[PDB]
């Protein structure tokens, strides 16, 4: 069978400018397990981004954790990037700062 | 006899056969709980009752193995609670044995023996005796399923003795607990030893321990002829194989019988003997293999004119090559009492690998004339590593010793876990305590004595578990190069470092609230992580790393909200240890 | 309520190169405790776990019981020839009862669907699909494999539980409230979004709701996930009309609290 991922992106902590944080990429619900995901910087791809195991849920859909420590500011955007063999193009969510 | 349970039952007495079946029960089944284990040793006991009124009655015929295993498989057939012993349950005899002997458990999970005041043990003590006495064997039995079974009925008795007396004394407690803290500490050692000759025959055979009984009862009856020391080693063997097979009835009769041998032949054994053999039984046998050592004959010759010299060493050795190296070393220990054993089989086994090479060579004689400047070094090589030892235990003191040890145990065996290596430390730290006190020239032997048993108790566990071929190859190779073996072990350069992370550092709140030996266990834990995350890192490295860590846990335990000064700082222990250990 | 120890295994035909063909997750209720894949070769503690006080050969024994599990994975797909890809997940484990009980699940998946078990009564594996068929028969061929399974439900993931509960207490009885935040922001003309939103807590169960008046306003749309740390993150959403949001609040219920807080908007 096939799974499209469910994307959320959300801090560990609540944001404060110019306060260190992690920010989460969590892609969950998903079948293959093989997928790609980057964590972005205003467009750019972080390099120092880690993830938790690759694991799955009970109806044996994969989940996974990416995170990557983080200093927001007023002006900067952060999203999450993800592509899966179910997906035409890579979906992107962009971090809406606790405001849904 | 048509009935061995009646053989022994009457050769044993009572009181000792059901000591002994319940010593059995207990190590074969380590996780029965002692109100089932007192049930089935009474049936036996009963059971072998009817063989003594009458051989001839059913079953009386059967192997003490097919009785006792079809006892205990009344209740190991449940997976549940006994795991793969309910895969023995289903095996008849012999198989049947030598599956419950595989899965003796040398690491059983089981409670702390946490003493209760001594006016409680002596009101249980009082209350119901022989059931307190019975509970001590098996709580004794079950966590050394080893334990040298006819000495335990003599720990037991003097176990009874002390309560006898101190339970009547005016301070209890101080009456008690020493003789209490004499038996624990003298059983920590009978086991450990029991452990390595169990070892000894089972993984490496009769000839290997035979070779080990010469050399320790030569140096202890060195006016005994070597004939007189043979026999006694055949004795010693059947013994050991005896209580090694778990056929501990058998071993006790015949340790029995050995001891009256012994007392019925000092003349041709040893001149230190006749007081022990007036004791009881128990008392008996115990003293006879504590006695101390016979004087050696007053005027030995050099060993070079029989085992160097003579025109035909070649000869003697290609007629009877292990009699002629049994008496190479029975007449090198009764000359040597302060060598450690193993360092005698050291130099036995040296001197064989020459004789195999050279009397096959041109002219032997030429070939093996310096044979015994080989041995120089393996003197050499033991007294500069527990010199080494000892400096650094006198410098750093017990914690920090042990410390040191656990990094250089995580270099050689990094796929260890890190409660493995803690524990492997603290046993090899011990060395400190028991042998760098003494003289100096006790040092070497009771060190390669004591490092033969912890590295033994490390290898019949990595046996069953096995994670490094390194370990491995020291374990099976040679017996008598296992110490040698393990500390030639470099640091090992295949083990792929863990890598750091976010969550490298991880801890909650509960650390806050601990006792500083629990503290001391969290940063030998870290201390054992930080080397797999850099095998090769330095003393210093080390140190700055354990240093932050330290501080990392000072600051977050103060603070106003713990687990959120855990999940911020832990990343920031990560950062600065990675650039403590050069990354 | 009921503790777990599960195991999550996986395996696939086609790597990608340097990821591994098989990895496991062991889990102590909402906790993951335990990690092994087959390009490391050891089972390793996770997290807090790391600290344990546990006893010596644990976590040897760990490793040396799912080094198993991968070579039947692997040979799994031997049994199937096909083409492929394949993905084989199992689902391993134990769980805690009323008398000293334990009740053990073991159930595996194929290309994302369930297809087959372990029947603990027979010690065989067992499906209906062909697929089911094939890999069943190559496990049950295989010397030992079957008993080597019926150990690992029925005495070592018990026995592992039990070590956990004991040693391991610090760790799973571990409380962190949330840190909260309710802020709004506009929405489609004349109406506002109004989130609640919970920071890393600890147990995962947590209710927020919406207040206004005292009275209930509603749960609003949810949603929910990890942190690196096992802690979890959570929000709720509410749409109200614009120029409202002041009338309401957020309250939050966690084993973390006391009682229920209540939260009000940020400017």
Same mark, same amino acid.
Request: charged share 25%; net charge negative; aromatic share 10%.
């Given at each position: 069978?096939?799974?499209?991922?469910?994307?959320?992106?959300?801090?560990?902590?609540?944001?404060?400018?110019?306060?260190?944080?992690?920010?989460?990429?969590?892609?969950?619900?998903?079948?293959?397990?093989?997928?790609?995901?980057?964590?972005?910087?205003?467009?750019?791809?972080?390099?120092?981004?880690?993830?938790?195991?690759?694991?799955?849920?009970?109806?044996?859909?994969?989940?996974?954790?990416?995170?990557?420590?983080?200093?927001?500011?007023?002006?900067?955007?952060?999203?999450?990037?993800?592509?899966?063999?179910?997906?035409?193009?890579?979906?992107?969510?962009?971090?809406?700062?606790?405001?849904? | 006899?048509?009935?061995?349970?009646?053989?022994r039952?009457?050769?044993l007495?009572?009181?000792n056969?059901?000591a002994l079946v319940?010593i059995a029960?207990a190590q074969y089944?380590?996780?029965?709980?002692?109100?089932?284990?007192?049930?089935?040793?009474?049936?036996?006991?009963?059971?072998?009752?009817?063989?003594?009124?009458?051989?001839?009655?059913?079953?009386?015929?059967?192997?003490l193995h097919?009785?006792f295993?079809?006892?205990?498989?009344?209740?190991?057939?449940?997976?549940?609670?006994?795991?793969?012993?309910?895969?023995?349950?289903?095996?008849?005899?012999?198989?049947?044995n030598?599956?419950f002997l595989?899965?003796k458990?040398?690491?059983?999970?089981?409670?702390?023996?946490?003493?209760?005041?001594?006016?409680?043990?002596?009101?249980?003590?009082?209350?119901?005796?022989?059931?307190?006495? !019975?509970?001590?064997?098996?709580?004794?039995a079950?966590?050394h399923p080893y334990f040298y079974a006819p000495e335990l009925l003599f720990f037991?008795?003097?176990?009874?003795?002390?309560?006898?007396?101190?339970?009547?004394?005016?301070?209890?407690?101080?009456?008690?607990?020493?003789?209490?803290?004499?038996?624990?500490?003298?059983?920590?050692?009978s086991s450990?030893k029991q452990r390595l000759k169990c070892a000894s025959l089972q993984?490496?055979?009769e000839?290997?321990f035979?070779?080990?009984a010469?050399?320790?009862?030569?140096?202890?009856?060195?006016?005994?002829?070597?004939?007189?020391?043979?026999?006694?080693?055949?004795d010693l063997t059947k013994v050991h194989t005896e209580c090694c097979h778990g056929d501990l009835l058998e071993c006790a009769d015949d340790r029995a019988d050995l001891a009256?041998?012994?007392?019925?032949?000092?003349?041709?054994?040893?001149? !230190?003997?006749?007081?022990?053999?007036?004791?009881?039984?128990?008392?008996?046998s115990?003293?006879?293999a504590?006695?101390?050592?016979?004087?050696?004959?007053?005027?030995?010759?050099?060993?070079?004119?029989?085992?160097?010299?003579?025109?035909?060493?070649?000869?003697?050795?290609?007629?009877?090559?292990?009699?002629?190296?049994?008496?190479?070393?029975?007449?090198?220990?009764?000359?040597?009492?302060?060598?450690?054993?193993?360092?005698?089989?050291?130099?036995?086994?040296?001197?064989?690998?020459?004789?195999?090479?050279?009397?096959?060579?041109?002219?032997?004689?030429?070939?093996?004339?310096?044979?015994?400047?080989?041995?120089?070094?393996?003197?050499?090589?033991?007294?500069?590593?527990?010199?080494?030892?000892?400096?650094?235990?006198?410098?750093?003191?017990?914690?920090?010793?042990?410390?040191?040890?656990?990094?250089?145990?995580?270099?050689?065996?990094?796929?260890?876990?890190?409660?493995?290596?803690?524990?492997?430390?603290?046993?090899?730290?011990?060395?400190?305590?028991?042998?760098?006190?003494?003289?100096?020239?006790?040092?070497?032997?009771?060190?390669?004595?004591?490092?033969?048993?912890?590295?033994?108790?490390?290898?019949?566990?990595?046996?069953?578990?096995?994670?490094?071929?390194?370990?491995?190859?020291?374990?099976?190779?040679?017996?008598?190069?296992?110490?040698?073996?393990?500390?030639?072990?470099?640091?090992?350069?295949?083990?792929?470092?863990?890598?750091?992370?976010?969550?490298?550092?991880?801890?909650?709140?509960?650390?806050?609230?601990?006792?500083?030996?629990?503290?001391?266990?969290?940063?030998?834990?870290?201390?054992?992580?930080?080397?797999?995350?850099?095998?090769?890192?330095?003393?210093?490295?080390?140190?700055?790393?354990?240093?932050?860590?330290?501080?990392?846990?000072?600051?977050?335990?103060?603070?106003?909200?713990?687990?959120?000064?855990?999940?911020?700082?832990?990343?920031?222990?990560?950062?600065?240890?990675?650039?403590?250990?050069?990354? | 309520?009921?503790?777990?120890?599960?195991?999550?295994?996986?395996?696939?035909?086609?790597?990608?190169?340097?990821?591994?063909?098989?990895?496991?997750?062991?889990?102590?209720?909402?906790?993951?405790?335990?990690?092994?894949?087959?390009?490391?070769?050891?089972?390793?503690?996770?997290?807090?776990?790391?600290?344990?006080?546990?006893?010596?050969?644990?976590?040897?024994?760990?490793?040396?019981?799912?080094?198993?599990?991968?070579?039947?994975?692997?040979?799994?797909?031997?049994?199937?020839?096909?083409?492929?890809?394949?993905?084989?997940?199992?689902?391993?484990?134990?769980?805690?009862?009323?008398?000293?009980?334990?009740?053990?699940?073991?159930?595996?998946?194929?290309?994302?669907?369930?297809?087959?078990?372990?029947?603990?009564?027979?010690?065989?594996?067992?499906?209906?699909?062909?697929?089911?068929?094939?890999?069943?028969?190559?496990?049950?061929?295989?010397?030992?494999?079957?008993?080597?399974?019926?150990?690992?439900?029925?005495?070592?993931?018990?026995?592992?539980?039990?070590?956990?509960?004991?040693?391991?207490?610090?760790?799973?009885?571990?409380?962190?409230?949330?840190?909260?935040?309710?802020?709004?922001?506009?929405?489609?003309?004349?109406?506002?979004?109004?989130?609640?939103?919970?920071?890393?807590?600890?147990?995962?169960?947590?209710?927020?709701?919406?207040?206004?008046?005292?009275?209930?306003?509603?749960?609003?749309?949810?949603?929910?996930?990890?942190?690196?740390?096992?802690?979890?993150?959570?929000?709720?959403?509410?749409?109200?009309?614009?120029?409202?949001?002041?009338?309401?609040?957020?309250?939050?219920?966690?084993?973390?609290?006391?009682?229920?807080?209540?939260?009000?908007?940020?400017?």
């Amino acid at each position: 069978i096939q799974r499209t991922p469910k994307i959320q992106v959300y801090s560990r902590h609540p944001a404060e400018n110019g306060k260190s944080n992690f920010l989460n990429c969590y892609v969950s619900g998903f079948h293959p397990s093989d997928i790609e995901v980057d964590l972005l910087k205003n467009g750019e791809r972080i390099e120092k981004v880690e993830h938790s195991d690759l694991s799955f849920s009970k109806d044996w859909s994969f989940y996974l954790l990416y995170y990557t420590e983080f200093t927001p500011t007023e002006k900067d955007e952060y999203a999450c990037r993800v592509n899966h063999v179910t997906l035409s193009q890579p979906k992107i969510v962009k971090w809406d700062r606790d405001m849904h | 006899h048509k009935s061995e349970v009646a053989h022994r039952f009457k050769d044993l007495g009572e009181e000792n056969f059901k000591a002994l079946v319940l010593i059995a029960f207990a190590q074969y089944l380590q996780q029965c709980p002692f109100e089932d284990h007192v049930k089935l040793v009474n049936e036996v006991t009963e059971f072998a009752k009817t063989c003594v009124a009458d051989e001839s009655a059913e079953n009386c015929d059967k192997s003490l193995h097919t009785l006792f295993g079809d006892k205990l498989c009344t209740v190991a057939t449940l997976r549940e609670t006994y795991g793969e012993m309910a895969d023995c349950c289903a095996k008849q005899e012999p198989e049947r044995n030598e599956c419950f002997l595989q899965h003796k458990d040398d690491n059983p999970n089981l409670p702390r023996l946490v003493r209760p005041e001594v006016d409680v043990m002596c009101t249980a003590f009082h209350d119901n005796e022989e059931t307190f006495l !019975k509970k001590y064997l098996y709580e004794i039995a079950r966590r050394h399923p080893y334990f040298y079974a006819p000495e335990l009925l003599f720990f037991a008795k003097r176990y009874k003795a002390a309560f006898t007396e101190c339970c009547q004394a005016a301070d209890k407690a101080a009456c008690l607990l020493p003789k209490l803290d004499e038996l624990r500490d003298e059983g920590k050692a009978s086991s450990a030893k029991q452990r390595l000759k169990c070892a000894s025959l089972q993984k490496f055979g009769e000839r290997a321990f035979k070779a080990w009984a010469v050399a320790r009862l030569s140096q202890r009856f060195p006016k005994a002829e070597f004939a007189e020391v043979s026999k006694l080693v055949t004795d010693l063997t059947k013994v050991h194989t005896e209580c090694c097979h778990g056929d501990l009835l058998e071993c006790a009769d015949d340790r029995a019988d050995l001891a009256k041998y012994i007392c019925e032949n000092q003349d041709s054994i040893s001149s !230190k003997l006749k007081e022990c053999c007036e004791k009881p039984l128990l008392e008996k046998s115990h003293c006879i293999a504590e006695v101390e050592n016979d004087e050696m004959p007053a005027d030995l010759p050099s060993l070079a004119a029989d085992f160097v010299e003579s025109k035909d060493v070649c000869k003697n050795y290609a007629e009877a090559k292990d009699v002629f190296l049994g008496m190479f070393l029975y007449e090198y220990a009764r000359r040597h009492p302060d060598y450690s054993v193993v360092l005698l089989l050291r130099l036995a086994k040296t001197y064989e690998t020459t004789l195999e090479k050279c009397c096959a060579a041109a002219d032997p004689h030429e070939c093996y004339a310096k044979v015994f400047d080989e041995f120089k070094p393996l003197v050499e090589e033991p007294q500069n590593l527990i010199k080494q030892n000892c400096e650094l235990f006198e410098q750093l003191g017990e914690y920090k010793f042990q410390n040191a040890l656990l990094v250089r145990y995580t270099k050689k065996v990094p796929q260890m876990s890190a409660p493995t290596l803690v524990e492997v430390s603290r046993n090899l730290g011990k060395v400190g305590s028991k042998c760098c006190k003494h003289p100096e020239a006790k040092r070497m032997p009771c060190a390669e004595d004591y490092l033969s048993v912890v590295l033994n108790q490390l290898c019949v566990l990595h046996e069953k578990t096995p994670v490094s071929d390194r370990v491995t190859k020291c374990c099976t190779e040679s017996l008598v190069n296992r110490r040698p073996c393990f500390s030639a072990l470099e640091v090992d350069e295949t083990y792929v470092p863990k890598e750091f992370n976010a969550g490298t550092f991880t801890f909650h709140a509960d650390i806050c609230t601990l006792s500083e030996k629990e503290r001391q266990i969290k940063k030998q834990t870290a201390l054992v992580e930080l080397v797999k995350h850099k095998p090769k890192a330095t003393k210093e490295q080390l140190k700055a790393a354990m240093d932050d860590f330290a501080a990392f846990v000072e600051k977050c335990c103060k603070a106003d909200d713990k687990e959120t000064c855990f999940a911020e700082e832990g990343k920031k222990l990560v950062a600065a240890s990675q650039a403590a250990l050069g990354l | 309520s009921h503790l777990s120890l599960l195991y999550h295994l996986t395996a696939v035909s086609s790597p990608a190169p340097g990821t591994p063909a098989f990895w496991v997750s062991g889990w102590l209720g909402p906790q993951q405790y335990l990690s092994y894949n087959s390009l490391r070769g050891e089972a390793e503690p996770c997290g807090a776990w790391v600290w344990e006080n546990q006893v010596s050969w644990y976590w040897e024994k760990e490793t040396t019981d799912l080094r198993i599990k991968e070579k039947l994975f692997l040979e799994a797909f031997k049994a199937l020839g096909g083409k492929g890809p394949y993905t084989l997940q199992g689902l391993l484990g134990c769980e805690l009862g009323p008398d000293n009980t334990s009740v053990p699940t073991a159930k595996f998946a194929l290309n994302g669907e369930e297809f087959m078990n372990f029947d603990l009564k027979q010690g065989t594996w067992g499906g209906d699909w062909p697929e089911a068929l094939a890999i069943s028969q190559r496990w049950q061929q295989q010397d030992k494999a079957a008993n080597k399974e019926l150990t690992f439900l029925l005495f070592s993931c018990p026995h592992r539980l039990r070590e956990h509960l004991e040693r391991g207490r610090g760790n799973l009885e571990w409380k962190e409230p949330p840190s909260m935040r309710l802020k709004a922001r506009p929405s489609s003309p004349g109406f506002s979004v109004l989130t609640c939103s919970a920071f890393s807590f600890y147990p995962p169960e947590l209710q927020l709701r919406f207040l206004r008046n005292g009275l209930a306003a509603g749960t609003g749309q949810g949603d929910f996930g990890p942190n690196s740390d096992g802690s979890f993150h959570a929000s709720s959403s509410l749409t109200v009309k614009s120029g409202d949001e002041h009338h309401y609040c957020c309250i939050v219920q966690h084993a973390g609290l006391a009682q229920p807080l209540r939260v009000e908007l940020e400017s």
